[PDB]
Point group: C5
C-alpha cells in the first residue's frame, strides 16, 4: 500500500481567515446553519475532504481561524474556496489572511515517511502550520551529506511519537518550498518538539519558516462561529 500512497495525487490547502470586527453580529444561528450546510454539501459531493477546522484565536494578530482541506484536483479546492467566500455569510464577513498550498509527493530518501493525512490518521486536537524555504545550496549539496543530515533530523524527533508530521512540497504553489503541519493531542508536546528540533544540523540550511499558525481543532463550525469577535 506504500507505493499506492506515494503515487497518489493529493492537493492540500490551509486557508487562514481573519474575522472583521463588527461584521458578524450577535445573532449567529442562521450563519451557523448556513456554514454547516455548506460543509455538509462539501462532504456529500465527495471531491473536497475537510480535514479540519481550527480556532486560531490568541495565536497571532492577523488570524482568527483556519480550514484544512484536501482534494485530488486543485481546481476542486479552488471551487470550494471561492464558494466558501461567495455563498456563505461566514466567508463574506472574513478576510483571507494567508493560504498554504501543497501537493503530495514521496520523500527524497526515506520513502516510508508519509504525511499523517495521506495515511488517514485521526487528526490531533492541536495543530501548528508553517511554510518552509531551504537554503539556496541545500538541493545541490552532495546527496549523501543531505541524506545524513535528514536522517539525523528525523532521529532527533524519536522522542515525540505522539506528534504527527505532514511535510508536503509547495513549489510553484506560493512563495514557499514546503508546507509543514504538526498535529498533537497537547500543545506543549508541539512546543517541546519544536524546541528539541533546533538541535539539528538541518537548522544550518533554513531561509524562511514564518508565519506560524497554531490552533485547536473544533468538533463543529458552530463552536468556531460562537467565539468569533464582532
Amino acid at each position: 500500500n506504500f507505493e499506492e500512497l506515494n503515487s497518489m495525487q493529493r492537493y492540500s490547502q490551509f486557508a487562514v481567515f481573519r474575522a472583521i470586527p463588527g461584521a458578524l453580529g450577535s445573532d449567529r444561528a442562521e450563519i451557523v446553519a448556513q456554514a454547516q450546510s455548506f460543509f455538509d454539501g462539501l462532504e456529500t459531493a465527495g471531491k473536497v475532504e475537510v480535514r479540519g477546522i481550527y480556532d486560531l484565536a490568541g495565536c497571532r494578530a492577523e488570524a482568527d481561524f483556519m480550514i484544512w482541506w484536501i482534494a485530488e484536483e486543485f481546481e476542486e479546492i479552488q471551487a470550494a474556496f471561492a464558494r466558501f467566500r461567495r455563498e456563505t455569510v461566514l466567508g463574506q464577513v472574513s478576510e483571507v489572511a494567508w493560504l498554504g498550498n501543497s501537493l503530495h509527493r514521496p520523500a527524497e530518501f526515506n520513502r516510508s515517511h508519509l504525511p499523517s493525512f495521506i495515511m488517514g490518521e485521526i487528526p490531533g486536537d492541536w495543530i501548528t502550520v508553517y511554510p518552509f524555504v531551504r537554503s539556496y545550496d541545500w538541493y545541490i549539496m552532495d546527496p549523501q551529506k543531505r541524506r545524513k543530515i535528514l536522517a539525523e533530523h528525523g532521529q532527533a524527533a524519536r522522542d515525540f511519537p505522539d506528534v504527527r508530521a505532514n511535510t508536503v512540497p509547495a513549489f510553484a504553489l506560493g512563495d514557499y518550498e514546503w508546507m509543514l503541519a504538526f498535529e498533537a493531542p497537547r500543545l506543549d508536546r508541539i512546543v517541546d518538539l519544536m524546541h528539541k528540533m533546533r538541535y539539528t544540523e538541518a537548522r544550518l540550511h533554513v531561509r524562511e519558516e514564518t508565519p506560524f499558525f497554531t490552533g485547536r481543532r473544533v468538533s463543529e463550525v458552530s463552536e468556531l462561529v460562537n467565539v468569533l469577535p464582532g
Copy 2:
C-alpha cells in the same frame, strides 16, 4: 524566422487584480456583458493581444485574477490597463495587487530559446508567474562560466517538454530583472518542474523570486466573474 522573432519588439504585462468583497454584488449579467464587450473591442482594435485571463483563487491571499496581455508599444498596454480600470465595472470593483512588466529580448547565449508567446504557441491550462532578480555578481561573472551554468540549468528541464517557459527581461519596468511564466496542461507538472529545477548551480545566484501567482486559464470572462466574491 528566428532572427525576426529575436528582433521583434513585444511588451508583455501580467496585471494581477484582487476582488473587493461586497462590491461586485450578486447580479453580474450586465457586468459580464460589459467586460466581454471591452475585451472584444480590445481584440478588434488589434493593438493589444490578450494572451490569457487566469483565475488565481486559492493561490494567495492578496490576488484574485490575472490578465496576461501583450502589445508592440507600452503606451498601448498603458491605455488598455487604464481603460479596464476606468470604463468597466469589473475594473472599478477590483484593486491592482501586482504588475509584472517585461520587454522581449533575445537570449544571451542560446538564441534558439524563445518565449512561448513569441512562438505563438497555444496557452496552457495552468500558469505560474513570478519575477526574478539575479545575484549582484551574476552578470560580471566570467561569460564562459555563466554560459555553462545556464546550459546545465536548461538541460535540467529536459524531462518537462510539456511545460513551456517564458523568460523575458524586466529591467527598468519595475523592481525586478526578469519575468518568468510557465504554462502547462497540468499544475502538478509545474510543481514537479519547479522542484527539479532546485538541483542546479544557478540556484546559487538568486536574490529574489517572489511573489508567485499560480492560476487556471478561463475560456471566457464570464467564468471568472461568476466565481469572484460578492
Copy 3:
C-alpha cells in the same frame, strides 16, 4: 519547591491592543464598568490570572495598551482573549496589534533561574516586552561554549537586581523562539540594563529582537480607559 516551579505548566500571553480613534467616544463610565466587571469575572473564575494591564501610550505608533495574563491551559487564554474581544466594548473598539505567547520551561543550564511571574514576585511599575530569535547555529553549538556564553551573559546583569527578568520559550506559538519581559520600578533602570547587556558575546548570536513594547502598569482598568484616544 524549585523542582515544582520548574515542572509546573504555565502559558503566558502579552496581548497588545491598538485603539481605534473616534470609536471609544467621550462617555466612558459604562465602558469602564463593563471592562472592570469582565476582569473581576476573570479573577473570580480562577483559571486565567491577569498579571498586569499596561499603558503603552507613547512607546510606538501601532500600540496603545497591553494585557499580560497567565493560565495553566492555553485554551483558557484563548477563551479569555476571544471573550475580551467579543463581549466588552473596550475589546470591540480596539484592534489586536501583536500577540506574544510563551510556555514556561526550565532553563537549559542554570535551573535556579526562573521567570518573575513563576516565582510570584510583585509586578514592577514599568515593563518592557519583546520576542527573541537566536542564530541558526546557536543550539547546535558546543554545549560547554553556549553554557559559558550564557553564564557571562547572566553575570553581565549583576548590577541590576531590581530588574526582574522573564525568559520564556515561545517555539511553535508564533514566529519567535523566546519571549522576554523585564519589570522594574523605574524605566531608566530598564534602559540602562538594555544598554549594558549589549557588551556580551551572546549579542553575536541574535537574529530578531523586535518589536519592543514598553509600558507602565496601571492600578485599574479605569486609569487605562480614561487616557485612550477618541
Copy 4:
C-alpha cells in the same frame, strides 16, 4: 559655465501619487481646469519649475502619476507640494505613494558629468526614476579604486547617448543616498541601458535600488486626468 552649474543650488523632487478609485468621478472638466490653473500659477510665480508630469499607469500597483519639479529652496517645494495637496481637487482625491528628494551637488571625480535638468536639456518622452543606496564600505574605499570603478561604469553607458542621466545626492532628505532619473525618447532604450549596466563592477557595491517608477511624459495635465481611474 560649468563651474556655475556645479555651484548652483537646486532641490529636485519626484512626487508620486496614487489615485483613489471612486473619488475622481466622471465629470472632470472643472478638475482639469483647476489643476491647469494651479500649474500655470506655479509657472507664473517663478519659484518652482515643474520639469514634468508623468503617467505611471501600468508600471506598479501603488502608483498612478508623478510630478517632477525643481526649486532653488526646499521650502518652496514644500509649499508647492502642500498647496497641490490642499487647494486642488486632483491633489485631494490622491494619496502620496512615494517622495524622492535630492539636492544638486557636483560629482566626486568627473565634474563634467551634470544632471540633464541642470544642463537645461529637453525632457524625454519616457522616464525612469529610482533611489539608490551604496554599500557600507563604498565611500571609505580607496579613492583611486572607486574612481576607476566609476570610470568603467560611465564608460559602460557609451552606447546610449540618447538616454540622459540625472544622478543627484539624496542624503538626509529621505531613506536613500542618491536619486537616479533616466530620460529617453523610447522606453526600450531605457530597458536596454539598464540591462547593459548590470555588466559593471559597481554592481558589487549596491544595497538598495527600489522602488522603480517608469512613466510617460504628458503634454498637459488634462491628458493625465482623463485617464485616471474614476
Copy 5:
C-alpha cells in the same frame, strides 16, 4: 556644570503624525486656537518642554508633521502625548506614524560631547531625525579600537560647527539603540554633513538608520495647521 549636564535625567520624544485627508476641513481658526491653548497649557504646567514643532511636508509619504518635546519623567511625556491625541481636534484628525523615544546619558568616551537640547542651545531652522542601530559586534569590540573609530568619526565633522547634533540612547524604548537629531540653519548643510559622514570607518558598523524625518521648524502651530491637507 558638565557633570550636572551628564547626570541630569531627560526623556526626549519625536512624535511624528500624518494628516488624514478630508478630516481637517477648511475652517481651521478654532482648531488653531485649541492647539495653541493646549501648547500654552503644556508650557505653563512646566513639566513637558516642547522643543519644537516641525513641518514634514514633502519629506516622505507617510509623515506630515513632528513634535519634539522633552520631560524629566516619561510618564509626563505619555500624558502629554495622550492628551494631545485625545483633547485636541488636531490630534484627533491625525494618525501617529512613528515615535522616537530616548533617554539622555553621558557619552562613552568623549564626555564633553552633549546633546544640543541638553546644553540649551537655540533650535535650528531645519532638523533631520532618524533612529540608529549599530552592528552586533560593535559594543564587544576592543574598547580602544571603538574609541579610535568614534574619535575619527567625530573629527570627520570638524567642518560643520553650524550643525548641532543630538545623539541619545534609545534602548528598550523602541526597536532602536540610538536616536539622532541634527539641527542646522540651512538644510543643505545637513545634506552635506550626511554626505561627508559616509567617509568614516564607523559606516562599517551600521545595521539600521531608517526612517528619516526632515523638517522645517515653525514659529507657531497656526503656521503648521494652515498648510496641512484638508
